[model samples]
Structures are given as C-alpha cells and as structure tokens.
Target chain A: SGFRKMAFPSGKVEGCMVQVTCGTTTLNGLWLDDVVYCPRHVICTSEDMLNPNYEDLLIRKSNHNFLVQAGNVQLRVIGHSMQNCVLKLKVDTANPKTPKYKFVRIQPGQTFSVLACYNGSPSGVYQCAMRPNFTIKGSFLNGSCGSVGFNIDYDCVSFCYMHHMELPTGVHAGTDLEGNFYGPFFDRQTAQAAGTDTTITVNVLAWLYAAVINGDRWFLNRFTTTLNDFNLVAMKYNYEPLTQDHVDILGPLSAQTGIAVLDMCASLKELLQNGMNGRTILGSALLEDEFTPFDVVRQCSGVTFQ
Target chain B: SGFRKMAFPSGKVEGCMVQVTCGTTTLNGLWLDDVVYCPRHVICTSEDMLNPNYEDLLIRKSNHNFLVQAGNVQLRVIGHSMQNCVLKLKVDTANPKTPKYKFVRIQPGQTFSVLACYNGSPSGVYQCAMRPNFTIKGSFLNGSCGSVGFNIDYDCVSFCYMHHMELPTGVHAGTDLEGNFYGPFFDRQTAQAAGTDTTITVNVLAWLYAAVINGDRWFLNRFTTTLNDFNLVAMKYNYEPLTQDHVDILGPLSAQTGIAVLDMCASLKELLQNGMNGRTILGSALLEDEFTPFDVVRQCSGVTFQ
Candidate 1:
C-alpha cells in the first residue's frame, strides 16, 4: 500500500561500524521472550551502508591464535596453536599463492585467524589451494591453518540493501506472484513523469529496509527482479546503465534465497486485503500496476526519483 | 580453546550504531573464504536498533502513502481509505486503547499496520491491543492491521550476547556434549584465584557467545550447571564481587538461559593436569577467590564494575 522510511539512531559512523547507546531510550537489537535478550546493541548483522571504499571485501580465517590483517584481509584469532606455526593460502586449496609471509611463531594455546579482499581481480569462482606454513616445528592438529577457503561477493548497493533489508518483515511480506516485487504496482509513466514520486520512493525503501533488517531470504527473488527492472529503466526517459553508485543505492538480493514471482502473489494479496494498497497503479515504461503492495517490492530500495 | 578478546573496529561509538568500515582493512562480521571478510558476521535479529526514544512507540500506517512516526510508534500513511476504520489494542487483541486519536480521514486503497514495545511493564505476558485513528473511510478486501502480542525480556547481558555472538559461527560449532562448552579442560582452582583469570573468562564468554549466538538450547543443562559452579566460588577469597565492568565485557547472556545449579550438573572435572590446584566449588559463594565469569554477569548492566 505505501512506504515507511526505516530509521536507526544517530551514532558513530566510521565505515561498516557504527555505535549508538542502548538502555531505556534507544535500541540496537531485538526482544524475543521474557528471559531472553540479545545484548549486542553495538554489533549484529546488516549491510555495508557505510563501507564506501570497496565494492566488496573477501576474507578468510583460521581457528588459531592472533588476529592478522594482511592486504585486503582481516582475520580473527579463535583456537590456539601449541607450537610454532604457518599461515598459507591457495586458490581452491590447490593454486597456492607465492610465499608471502614468514613462518610466524604461534605459541601453544594462542588463537589465530586471517583475512583479505578482492578489488580489480577477474570475477569468477576462485577455487583456491593451500599448504602448511610450518613443517617440523608445528603440528596441524594443534597449530593448524588447514581451515581457510574462497569467498565471493557482489556490487555495493545490492550488498548493502540486501543486508540491511533482510529484516523480520520478509517472512510476512514475501514477493508477489510474478516474483516481481514492486513491478506489478508501479505506474512507470507516473514515476518517470515525476521521478520524485513519493509513492514509489517510500514503498520501495520500506520493503527493502524491512527485508534487509530481517535478512529474509524468502523475498529476495522479487526484490532482485524488481531492482533489475529498475536498472533497465533506471534512467527511465533514457534507459541508462547503472553506475556502481546507482547500483550501490539499488543494492542486490541473493537471487538464490528470496521468493519467486508466483510465490509472492498470495502474500501480497493477503496484505492487500488487510490494509496495504488495495488496487492498481501506473508508471513509466512499465504499465498496468495491478497489485501495488506486491509490485512496489519488485523495484525496492532507494528510489532516487530525481 | 583460549581467550581472544573481542575486537570491534574504530567506529563512531556514541550510542550503539557506531560506523566502522569493512574490507581488506577490518571486520566485525565473518569470513567464509578468500574474501577478507568478517567471520563473526550476519545471521541475527532484533527490533529497529537505531529508532531512538519513546519507551514504547505504538505506530500504524496506511499502505496507500506517507510515513508517520506518531507518538511512541510509527504510522505508515499508505494508499487511501474508502470506508470506516478502527484501530484497537487489548491485553489480547480484545483489550483496546481508549479515548483514541482524532477521527482523521483515511482515504480508500491505503495500507495499514501497527507496532509497539513493552518497557517498564509487567513481566508475565501482555497481549496488546490497538484501534485505528480513522473513523469511516476505508475498504479492505485487501490490507489490514491485524497483529498484536506481548514480548518478554531476559538479563540484558544474555540477550545482547545472544544476538552478537550468534554470528557466522553458530552453524559451524553447535553445543558440544558435556553440556559444557569446550569444557572438562579448564583449571578450576586458577579461575577462582583472580576473577580476571583467562581460563574462566575465555571459556565462559566463548561458550556463552557461541551458545547464545547459535541459540542452541539443547545443551542448556550443561552450560547452566557449569556456570552455577562459577557463582558458588565467585567470592572464594571473600574479596572479589564482580564489577559491572566485568559483565560489560563478557556481554549479556540470558541469565535465565545458561546453566543454573538449582534447575541444574556434573561434567566439572578438576584440571589436575595443569599448574593449578583444585577443590570443591560451593554454590553462590565468594570463597577461594573463585568464579569470575558468573560473578561478572550477575552484576551486569547499570553496573560499572571497578
């Protein structure tokens, strides 16, 4: 039926980390039952709303002792190595990288982990390889670095929106029948004509924020498909390709998890009968916005209708 | 296996929504593979973390259009109202809020939903109630505000820890047998000497974080019993009663969730293997300078342990 701007309090905004106070006045987490409370008001999972430097960051870790941040990687030290150890990397566990760091000494009972990110590298599944950094001095059983692997990622907008929007709302508001979230209800002509249409803007963002906050995979498909359409007509009047910036605003969804077009129809219709938008809408390029609530979710996120 | 101090990047630390960047440079999340990723990241839920103030904000919205943060809650002004409407609230849904808001105009084809939080309220269950501010101008073959309930809470430490620690690790580590997490290995005698003991600190926090993070209630009995011992020997030397500062560190794990001797355990084996002495750990005491983690959590939040 409409839109609701998701809100978070003012806090320390560095990059991926932000701090806000908790207690009587503010909140950073949820309330489940009576005896159960989740304290992490400062840390939890959301999207890269502030990580502006890179499109995506790739990383890995070993359950050893000591935190190590090498290149685009940041690792956490979990388990401990009983002797001197080594940290090594390989593509898919086979194509190992050239000798990088020296054999670091990981004392007994010390925790260790590793990290790295990909920037301009060729985008493809990198089946990496690996080898022990220590031979005689350390035993993998105690000082093992055998647990690391390949990580992949996506565009910034898609990532942020996807992360932030996966909220508690997803289970409730799924994708519409066509798997097109906000697609069906958008009056393309109207959105294009005014560009700054509040109807489109708020509804889209509301759905995205809800979905993001909840991390609901049920509706990802609809959100993704809806955004894809937005990309095609992003420049509505001209059909311009989205720059990473625009994509950043648009954000992506895990196409693998969210709901399908047909799947969304029932939920949207259910919402409609309840109190959401009850009917049709019109928009640019796209036409006949029949199920507004369902369709709005199709093309979600920040609708920069400028 | 050992202690690894929790590390959060340098971010805006005001309330809780602190912003710290992500990528090759840092992480507070998780790392799955080659991506210099944050490992303790993703997969958790809670209320809107940044929505400031209003102990209990009860809000509603119309799908047709507009976003409204009325009183303690938020109201979404969506679609239009074509008929009469009513928003009511009760202990259950039957118990509605009275002397309602102005009989405002609700146009046809609008969306509607409501929300409210329970704070400073009674514990048992309070089934909520609500009613529309609009009089007679809405139709709903589709769309309605039809959800209400009472939410309980737990020790803030447990809740916070549950949310924060239920990071990317839960799926991987699960509740180990012994009901004890990484247990039967720590030197009990040493842990009692100085509440700041690493063995007790790391194991308790790690297991709490991991268990809460995973929300694996399966091993509840073990963890509970394990902690009960901590409580008994907490003040072993009759010197240390944990400062709030201590709980602030281990984080809030539902005091109601972890092991408790009352509702409780036997997996505790004396660490006769180390440079430590051993003995009997009494229940809820301050003897032998024992039990740091248990004492720390007890004085949690609102506590500024010295």
Candidate 2:
C-alpha cells in the first residue's frame, strides 16, 4: 500500500519559476546551431540514480505520513486532521540532487490525487517532501521544501504541469503555452492527424540540445548516431521520440547554412557535362551565372528516377 | 471561489469596459430609457465598499517585498529558506484584490521550503514572495504595493471578474474575451446555491452582446425609477428608445403636443363608449388619446381561479 501526506489544503505550497531565460537568440541558436531546443527539465541527476528520499522527509513530519506508490502514481495526502490542508510535493525521480516535480495544491478532505508528470515520468530512484502552509497551527503541516535529504546533483526544478511553463513571454495563454500534445489525443488537436509532431520535435531537439549543453557525448551520439541508441535513451526516460519521419527531415536539413556559395559561373551545358539538366544538385558547392530566371538550369548523371 | 486570470501571462490584463466615452450624446443618460440587452461586467466601481490597491511600478531589481493587501486586506509572504522560488495565484471572487490562493519548489535535501498556495484550501492567512529570474543573490521579494497598512483603498488596476457570472458562456473559455455563463451554474459550484445571480445576468448580457451588447430597461421600474429620470439615461448607454414600443402607440396620440390637432377628432364620450371609440385616459400622460389596444385589453387584476 502507499502512504499519503496527512492533509493538503488548496493553498499550502506555491512554487514559482526560478531559472534562466529561453531568450529568442539562444532558442534560435538551439534550433539553428544545435539539434533542438534544450529541454527545460531534468534528464538525470549527478548521482544518476533515483536516490530521492522524499519518503524520508515525510517520516520526519510524521512517521505515518510518508509517500507510498498509490498505484497509477496517484499522490495522495493522509494522516492529518485539518479541514483545509495544503502540501507542496517535491519529487526527485532521477538524481536526488536534481529531482523533477511540481507543487500540487491539495484541498480540504482531498484524499487520492494524481501528479501531472510535467517532464518525463519518474525514473531512476526517487525522493520528495511535502511543505504546507506555515500559519497552520500545531504543525498541521505548512511551510516549505526543496528536498528532504542527500541533495543530489541539481540545477533546476522539473514539472510537466501547464502552470510550470516559464516561456520567455509570461505563460498567459494557458492551453497554447503547454506542450499538451503529450496528452492522449495530444495530436488530434495539433496541426496534424499523423501524431504529435510538435511534442516529439521539441522532446528530440530538447534532448539533443541537453546533450550538447551538458557535453554528454554518448547521449549526443545516441541522437545523431542511431535510432537504437536514441530509443535506448528514450526507454530510460519514458519519453520515446518517434524518429522515423521528422527525424529524417530534421537531420539533414539542420545542416543548411545561409551561405555556401562557390564563386563561379557556368552555362547549363557546361555545368552538366553528363546531360544532367534539371536533374542536378551539388554538395557544399555552388553553381552561379547571375542571370534572370535561373541563369540557366542543369542536371546530373544520376538523373532518371526510373 | 475564483475568476480565473485572463489566460494572459504578461502585463496584458484583459479587463472589461471602463470610463469615458460611450461616444455619447453622453452615457450619463442611459438609465433614462428601455430595453432587453444589458451590460455584464462592472461598468464602474460604486463609491463602493472596497476601493483597491494595484501597485504598478517596476524595478528589474528588488524594490521591496510588498504585496500590500489594502486595509480590509493584506498580502503577506511568510519567510522562506529556499534560494529562489515564486508563485502567483489569480482569483476573481466578489473582490478581485483578494484571491484565496501554491507550490513549494525546493532543491535536494534543501532543508527549508516555500509552499505556494494553489489548488487546495487555505489552512490560514497566507503570505508569499514573488520570484523572478533576476537572480538577486539575497532574497528581496520583488514588489511594492500601493499603500501602507490600513490603506487598502488604492489602485493600479480594477477588473470585474467574469467567473462570478453563471450565464451560459462556458466561462470555460476563461480569460477568453467574453463572459461565461459559469455563474447561473456559478451558483452551482459555489459555497451557497443562492449567491452569484448578479454574476450570471451580466455574464449572459455581456455574452449575448459580445455574447449580446448595449440594450434593455423599463418594465425597468423593473430595474430603476420614473420614466423621466430613467428613459433619458438609457439612450446614453448606446441603447435605443424602445419608446419605439411604447412609442409605436404613444405617437399618433400624444396628440404629441399641447397645440396638437385632432385632424381626426373623437369626443371623450365617443372614445370609451363600448363601440370602444378612441378616448383620452391617464395623467400618466403617455396614455392620453389611447385607443383599441388599451380598451380591448382585459384585466387579470384581482381575478382568481375558481
């Protein structure tokens, strides 16, 4: 059976965004200079294991008030006798140092609950703490929390909750602001019926971006290297990026630079010695003639699709 | 319990109509007429009970940790030990200034915590600090409300919360530019089933107008005072004369003036005589040369069921 926090009143714990800017410049760079938008949540902790002892903190508050896995990852509050109780549940699922979780507002008589996995689901080991409203008399549980113990390699907070998006712009457009494409019909509402292209794209780019930012060569290799490797990373984090289509598009296209012109001139005949008019292209080189409508078209040797 | 904040995440506060120009012959006269469509949000604040306090100053750096909750009000932030955290909860109750508020985002083994009041019940008077990415090493909460203690009557802003409206608009379109009928049902989700009507009617009118706009009064003695005092004003709110109704008949008869001619004459005797001739009735004035519609009309007054 699982353990629940004593009681969670609606306003118990409030958390705010406290990180860096996803400035347009850096954001643009992440897409243009790198493989993707660096994901904004935790991927792994320094300890590299779910060394969270959030349950440990619960015991500190009340031996009977620890967190137990209520199946379906439902985070419930228990053990308290207050009418309106609130708790801030912080969980470190990967590295105890930098665990990812969010503030859950538990109301009066609220028993069972579910935590929106804002980032990826819980993995590695896990730890958490429930901070309540301090004015709560008699330690009915109110106050604060980071984690309870063993600070693991940590940097930022993690949450899959919509309220957690710290977009460069204040996140006012609730629905648009959240990457809800992760929801069941996540894609139905998207621009395509095929699937969650936006979610997968962000996740992939962010994953790859994190690897670059963290200088994780092996992880980076998993992305550019092979699908098997990428899937392995996905399996570990519970966020499998469907790479068949979009990846193919993004992979080669990401290399397109604004300037790769070869300084030279040629006629359509001279340019394609293989009679490759209209069926030609080049590498990092250029074919220029400075004329209207094309300066003349060309083709290459591997011409026929037939 | 709450009117959701405009899905607006930035300085963009989406409030309803305000002072000045209905582009009027002057709106000072609207209570003067009649209609069916009505306004929804606060067209204006009464010399009303609560004034308000919305401090509007900005310092990229800390000014003071003051979220002054004007006299009948107070916004306090309990002390916290975390390095950085912030939370902003929005609620549109009867009074917008006070929103009953959550999350505690802490680092690993980070002994101390700050819980933000969010989705649960408030166990007690809550105080919180605003967190931003400014990175001010020492904690200096970012804000300076309008006034000091006992001076809640102030303002940087005042907005009518549509959530209080229980009309038919899915108030679910929250922060969306229209009034939701959430209130008729607003009462439905409230602590008291009887509260929230003032909220619903406006929402409906506001809805039908936007959802429906500038309209109704009379029968409005159903709403205000004497015709002279009221009808003269209705026209100002951009509402037209339904004198059009009272007029379609009132005309041709006011004889419209004192020197008015009876190009078509009728004797007071010939008027009310069962043949039901047109006759003059009423010092109430508009009923003067009244005809068929009035005499042919029957009365249920004092009439009872057998």
Candidate 3:
C-alpha cells in the first residue's frame, strides 16, 4: 500500500506542494500515479506555471438551484481499490481573512458548475480534500484503472493523495471513556497537536455556535437545597419564612403577598452575580444567605457561551 | 303635688323664670294658678337679654373673674347638684363664627347657666333653660312677692309671667308613655294643632332612616345583578332579549366571582330615589341589563312621610 497525489484533469503542474506519504508504498498500487499522469488535456495551472489562463479550466455547477450562487467546485475520485484513506487540503493565500469558505454536502453523481467565484476570494489559491465514506477493496482495481481529478475552473489548485497509513481505530489516548473533549487552544502546542497524530482524535472544543444540551439537574438541586435551608432557619425562630414551604404548610397565600420575599431573593442574586468577584461560582456559596435556590438557578441558567 | 315659680332664696323674680315640679305628676298639676305650662320653657321676649358686654368680662385674680363680657358667651350645666352650679366666662370677639363655650356635663342634679353674646345682627338675647335632674316645690301668694325678698342678687328682668289658675291633679293629657310629660293644656284641640294655641306637645317619632338603608340595598342589588348578567352575556352569545330564566341561572355565577354588582344597583336606586320616572328607570334597566334584589326592594318600599 502506498500514497500519491491525485492530479486534476488540467495537468500535474503544481505550486507550493504539500507532500503526503503512506508508510513506504509507491504511487501505483492505489492508482495514485495514474491519476497524476492522466491523458486529459491541461485546462488550468498554478500561478507558478509559465502560462495560466482562467478560461481553459473545467467549470463546476451547483446541482441544486437554490444554492447556485454559493458556487460548486468538487474533486472527482475514480479509484476502485482505494481503501481507508484520509484526504487533506492546504489552502495558500496572501491574505487569510479576505475570503470565507464553508463545506457543504453534495449528492453522488450530481453535476456541478465551477466558476472563479468558487475560489471564495479575489484571484487567490485554495484547495479541497475528501475521503471514502468506508474502506475500498484492492482486488476491485484489477480490470479498471482508478482515476481521481477535480473541477478547477476557479483560481484554486488542490493536491489529493490516498494514504495507506494505519491510524488508531478508537478514541485518542487522552480522551475519557465518555469522549468529552475541551479546549480553548490558547497555546500553539496543544491546539495543533490534538488531531495531528491519529485519526481517532475528535475535537471536543465548544464553539460559540455549537449546540449544547442544557441540563436541569444543577438548577433543581440548588433550588431545593436553598428552600430547605431557609425553611430550617425560619422554623428555628418559630417564624415561617415566606417560602413555598410556608405556602404549602400554612394556609393559602396570594402571589402578591409573596412578592416581597421573591424580590429579596432576586435582588440578592443579582448583587452576587454582578459583584466584585470575577468568578461567581465560588461566591455563589457565600451569597446563599441572601438568595434562595430558585433565585440562584434562575439567574445562573440565563448565562450562555456566546 | 303643685308646681310653682319660686325665686332663688325665696323672693319676687321678674325675668325668665324656670319652675320645676316634683312627685312624678302630670304636666297639668305642675303649673302655676290659671296657667298651663310645658316642660320645655317658651322664650318670647328674653331673646334680647342674653347679649354680653365685652369690657365687663375679664380674667382677674379673683373678683373680676366673675364679671360678664361682650364676646360670645355659652351656658353649660355643671355639677351633680345645683349647689355646685357655676357660670364660666370667656371674652373672644375674634371669631364670631364659632361662639366660645365652656365644657361641663349636666349630671343628675345640675342647673344650666343663662348666657348672652353680641355676635349676631341686633345681638342675640338668650334665656338658657334649666332642667333640674331632681325636683322642686314652689308656693305663690296673692299680690306679687316683693322684690328683693330673697337674699340673692338680681340682674335686669328678661321675662315675667302670672299664674291664671291651677289644675286639680298633676297628670296632663297628650303625654307620652314614658311619664316624661310635655304639656298642660286647657283642651285637646288646641294642643293637637302644630305650633298653635296655648298647649304644647312633645312627640318623639321613631323610624328607621329609610333613605340610607334603601339606598345601600339598592346599590348592592343593582351591582350584583348587573355584574352577574354581564358575566353571563360575556360567556354566552350576545342575543336579542334575555329571558328571566337566563338571568336566574347566570345571576348567581357573576355574584360568585365577587364582582361589584351592588355598586351598580346603588346608582340605579339613587336615581329612582331622587324622583326619576318609571320610564327612566326602565330605560336605565335596558341599558344596564341587570337587576338585583335591592332594586326590587326599593321599588316596593313605599314613600316616606316625615
């Protein structure tokens, strides 16, 4: 088994090459070399080439009309024997922030159009990579040759390689059994190292827009505990605190009658939340004298990672 | 027992004389000869004698304290016995609107003082009447008793009367069941007339303050009924004419909600009580679309006489 870069139909001409190797095996076993040397006419080239023209490239079109303006540029893979492979794309540009790109799912065998806008930037370089959804068999490549190429009408060049490299089959070494990963990646070493070593490594960092499951357990526990303590104190003095317990035990009281107690707890919680302490979690315990569990839970639950 | 007009300390008196009778007899038996008298004193000419002289009344160490005044004067009954009866004095011409009066409780045996003030037009002449809680006995001989026969000092005469003849028994006609007699008269016809003849009658009519009670009831009933009907209409379809049966069923439902139906009833009752016609009441009824028990009661209660 070996790895080699798959060539675009346009030609093998390349600039700023990123070498990817799979152990020691050569390029032909998975038809990587065939893809690199395909007889298709050169339609595009990197700026490093002697002459590159925008009109000569194959254009890709979006399969769905609704997202046509989003642009469609895709890499085509024709290999029959390629198995368990990871693809990588390295984008090169003079200015990183000028263009924004996102990956979208496409249906199989759908024709797409490619245009200069697909480059997602102003006449800059870009790349795309894809991997097989599952393993491909080596014997399946006997009769038909494997070919991989990309539609590159846009001002971007992609180098694709199939690697026979063995990756760890399970979760990475540092992750817990439940597979929760956390990171702000403030330091370079930790941030770059997580997914570099193994395919099993998954990014567990919480993004600002990520969906998170909001649990009610913490709030419930806090509210119940606070009410219990308040009731205990009230009982010691033979004076019932204006609490749910008081309402439950003593006769019915109006919601208006309980407003003062509710306001007191709410004010206390607000003060604690906004006080001098940068971290309120530790200060929350000290503020217990001022708030009920209900107030604490209500106040804290309102905060979310932006 | 016989009634007589006796001068204080036994002497001839020629002012407004108050004669007290004893032995629990009728008002007729308590009169002087040939004159029928009433318990309440009649003042015809004594209205001018009660004016005060401002300069004469002043607070001094001892002697000048007893002098009279030109400002407002008040008479109050003092002490549990006539022996402790005394006159209080004040010189306050500053505010003629409210006459200055002394504080005293007319107890079981006290006598009231006669007061005069120069506040009103032509100055008021007042002869304060005395009602001795106990009783008095008097004797009158022919030819007037000589002046200064009594050891008491005298002021200017305010009124004078002579006895015509005396009646046999003490009981008087046209008296209440309380034996607290009011008149001694020559005939019933003269006494029956309102403010006419020589006879006087004291009748204490006892009746409920109908306007207050009925007004309140009317308000309560109207409000309750109207609110009930309103609630019913709100719940049901707004139809043409509501039947009595519908009202009967839904009226209680509105009242159960503690709506102010009585207030509405009170408004209607006030209008009716102020001489509004039946047509007006009916028109208001149609507009309000509610009637309560108080409304029915007000309509049924007959007109008041006194």
The ten-residue window of minimal lDDT in model 1 chain A covers A155-164
In model 3, where do residues sit more than 4 Å from their true spots? A1-306, B1-50, B54-221, B224-265, B272-306
Task: Give the DockQ ranking, best first.
Answer: 1, 2, 3
lDDT of 3 by residue, A103-197 (tens): 22322111111100111111101111121122111111111111221222223322222212111221111101111112211101122222322
How many backbone collisions does model 3 have?
A: 34
DockQ per candidate: 0.03, 0.01, 0.00
Fnat per predicted structure, each in turn: 0.03, 0.02, 0.00
What local lDDT does model 1 show for residue A145?
14
Chain A TM value for model 2: 0.18
Q: What is the interface RMSD of candidate 1, in Å?
A: 23.7
Worst 10 residues of 2 chain A by lDDT: A297-306
